[PDB]
Design a binder for this molecule. Structure first.
Ligand SMILES: CC(C)CN(C[C@@H](O)[C@H](Cc1cc(F)cc(F)c1)NC(=O)O[C@H]1CO[C@H]2OCC[C@H]21)S(=O)(=O)c1ccc([C@H](C)O)cc1
Lengths: 99, 99
């Protein structure tokens, strides 16, 4: 679809069989979700944001459905204030900015 | 134009008479710019993201041109690692997400 920006671009995602709300975030290189139980193996990683760096759990090759568009990529799980869908997955669903 | 998300959506802006590089960020409600000494009155604010909060100075009704598209709104100035163009200005230039 076409998404205007007068409101937050929040969408419903499906990951690990559970539905969640997340923000389409073109300013994020990576996808970062709040604490949740994901299946599979993971490795410790660090990610930096506006306030500094946090420790996260890196899950690779995770199936995630964004508004009915399938993606398979890296998902970082940790103390982010907001579930954000970053460019690593936005590219998979064919998302572009237009003005 | 159309901006793909293979790389950071970095564009040239003009603010306070200066050219800068800034991120078109659908995940940001408001616009946050690197430290710069702007004239006029301002009020202090704390803004939060991954890693915590930073202190910024809120300026109102600031003019910024983003790829030849003029916008005027609130800008937050402080120690951000990147200039962030948020939805408050992305709407004014006609920016949409499309997938
Ligand atoms: C988290 C989100 C809900 C909000 N943020 C936007 C977000 O797009 C941010 C931009 C960004 C920050 C940064 F320090 C470096 C950078 F390159 C990009 N991206 C980000 O943290 O991404 C993470 C994951 O991927 C990595 O790539 C880049 C960093 C890593 S914010 O910046 O906290 C913010 C808060 C409040 C306001 C106003 C007050 O409303 C405006 C902005």
């Amino acid at each position: 679809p076409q998404i205007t920006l007068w409101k937050r671009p929040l969408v419903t995602i499906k990951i690990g069989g559970q539905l969640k709300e997340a923000l389409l975030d073109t300013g994020a290189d990576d996808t970062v979700l709040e604490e949740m139980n994901l299946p599979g193996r993971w490795k410790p990683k660090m990610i930096g944001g506006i306030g500094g760096f946090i420790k996260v759990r890196q899950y690779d090759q995770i199936l995630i459905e964004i508004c009915g568009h399938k993606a398979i990529g890296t998902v970082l799980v940790g103390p982010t204030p907001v579930n954000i869908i970053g460019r690593n997955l936005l590219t998979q669903i064919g998302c572009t900015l237009n003005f």
